[PDB]
Design an enzyme around this catalytic site. Sequence first.
Site, PDB file in Angstrom:
ATOM      1  N   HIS B  41       0.674  -1.511   0.365  1.00 26.57           N
ATOM      2  CA  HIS B  41      -0.025  -0.131   0.284  1.00 26.57           C
ATOM      3  C   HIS B  41       0.878   1.092  -0.148  1.00 26.57           C
ATOM      4  O   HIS B  41       0.213   2.192   0.078  1.00 26.57           O
ATOM      5  CB  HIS B  41      -0.947   0.168   1.214  1.00 26.57           C
ATOM      6  CG  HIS B  41      -0.661   0.394   2.697  1.00 26.57           C
ATOM      7  ND1 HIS B  41      -0.821  -1.163   3.583  1.00 26.57           N
ATOM      8  CD2 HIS B  41      -0.235   0.910   3.151  1.00 26.57           C
ATOM      9  CE1 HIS B  41      -0.797  -0.154   4.256  1.00 26.57           C
ATOM     10  NE2 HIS B  41      -0.539   0.948   4.248  1.00 26.57           N
ATOM     11  N   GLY B 143       2.470   6.368  10.217  1.00 23.28           N
ATOM     12  CA  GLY B 143       4.060   6.037   9.438  1.00 23.28           C
ATOM     13  C   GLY B 143       3.982   4.935   9.699  1.00 23.28           C
ATOM     14  O   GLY B 143       5.714   4.756   9.706  1.00 23.28           O
ATOM     15  N   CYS B 145       3.285   1.815   9.373  1.00 25.74           N
ATOM     16  CA  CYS B 145       3.555   0.861   8.499  1.00 25.74           C
ATOM     17  C   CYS B 145       4.165   0.715   8.480  1.00 25.74           C
ATOM     18  O   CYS B 145       5.353   1.517   7.739  1.00 25.74           O
ATOM     19  CB  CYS B 145       2.553   1.147   7.378  1.00 25.74           C
ATOM     20  SG  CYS B 145       0.679   1.308   7.683  1.00 25.74           S
TER      21      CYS B 145
END
EC number: 3.4.19.12
Lengths: 305, 305
Positions: B41, B143, B145
Amino acid sequence: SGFRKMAFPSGKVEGCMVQVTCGTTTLNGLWLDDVVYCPRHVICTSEDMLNPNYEDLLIRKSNHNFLVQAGNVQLRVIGHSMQNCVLKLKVDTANPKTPKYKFVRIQPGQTFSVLACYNGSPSGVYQCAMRPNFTIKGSFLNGSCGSVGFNIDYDCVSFCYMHHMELPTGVHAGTDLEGNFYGPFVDRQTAQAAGTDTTITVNVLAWLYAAVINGDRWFLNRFTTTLNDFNLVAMKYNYEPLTQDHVDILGPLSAQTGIAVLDMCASLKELLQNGMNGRTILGSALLEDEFTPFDVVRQCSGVTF
Amino acid sequence: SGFRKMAFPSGKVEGCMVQVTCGTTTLNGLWLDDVVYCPRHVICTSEDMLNPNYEDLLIRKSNHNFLVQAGNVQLRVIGHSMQNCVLKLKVDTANPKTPKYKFVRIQPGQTFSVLACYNGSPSGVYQCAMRPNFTIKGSFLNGSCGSVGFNIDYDCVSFCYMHHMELPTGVHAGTDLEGNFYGPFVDRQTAQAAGTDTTITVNVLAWLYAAVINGDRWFLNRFTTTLNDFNLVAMKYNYEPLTQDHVDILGPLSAQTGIAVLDMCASLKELLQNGMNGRTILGSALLEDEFTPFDVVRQCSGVTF
């Protein structure tokens, strides 16, 4: 979202951990630049610890009696001295992994990370607080002495604790990195009892603000209070007295949440008087006091190092 | 003595964390040898996440669209592909800090450490468990991830988790390092609800053994029980069914303490039925289930890496 008991990343300190052996005793030391810091009781036998005379014991030691190993990096000891309850071993090689660092002596209520080590090798990391009675509630087995506590601010590792002693009640005592014990404790196996384990009120409040930020909101009530009125309650429940300085430190969390500090004190007062009624806050069934205001801001804004 | 929620030392993983930017989106990646692993993603905008077609979105991307920074070590992307819900970015330089490692897919009930990172920079470390409903209860802000979960056995880092999603209930979902989600979750902003948060019974028992080892003994009673009788109780209280396999795993802790597993089950049964009566175990007012039998043995015997 979520809120966890969160230690500093430990890599910068891992690179400083060494093994120190003197005759029969092996513990941990901290290698910064060309000095290794370790508990002075590395020079003691089991039997010595009942009543050691450290100046006299140290007269029987020379540089070559101290065996220092960094992994297998074997270090050469070229000088030694005692400073309070620590030994400083000057070695011939500066640690190449030395982080930017300082030595600080923390106040009761402050939190720090511990890197628990055995035989020079780090085993785990956890977060704890200097209790108001100057003990810490750690996790330390035989061989862990010389493990250190620290804080990290971007580039800089602030060392604040070196582990020396376990008391009979299973709580922990130690020194700053100048070798001065926190509290009244000594490096002798003696009758040393801890004072009252009081609760760190300003930390509790910080954690309630953390709770609100996360949707844990049930404990907000209709009430307010005053500093003096709240403190009558703190005293009953063996909580630290709250000062205007504490109120000021909570200002950012108040501003973020729009919940006045004295309104959060009124929430805390009700929790003290009435309990949790079998409910939970941030996964806890008791009021947590080992997060500082600064800890809550850090974790809630994603500060890095 | 003492028992704490104890993470693995994080240094080996800190050395593998990088920043990955694709157009507008910055998250974390894991650099092992000459590959950077990150959530797929990273290629999505905010709006894309409502219903992304990842194969189609990725057609618009070339190697040069992926900006990878290790500190300021700027890495050159020389190939990319998608594997399930992760991207593998082949770079031209092997990470010199690559630890010995493996990729494992863990079972619900297993615990692991998380190194929470932002913009490639590690912020903190904490310990958590794969819940029976395949969520984790973490601490992750925007932030984070691409932050990873891991276990360390002496030389070897076993990576088991990469963070991808926060659900509306504020719990966390992610993948193994092959990119397969744990549980039914997807990398789409959709209606995804978590199943029952059941309690990890074998972990509770392990923690009670830890408690005994430390002098927390008040919950030992006169009673025993059987697997089937205990399980009637587990079911009522949304505890996992206890199996003979679980009993076998607890064998070492039983042998160490001389408390039969079924006698500890009878203690647990009384705690479930009667509660704590305002008492505490290892500093907790509720039954903790994010320590495994292996975790208790580790911490109680001082295993190092």
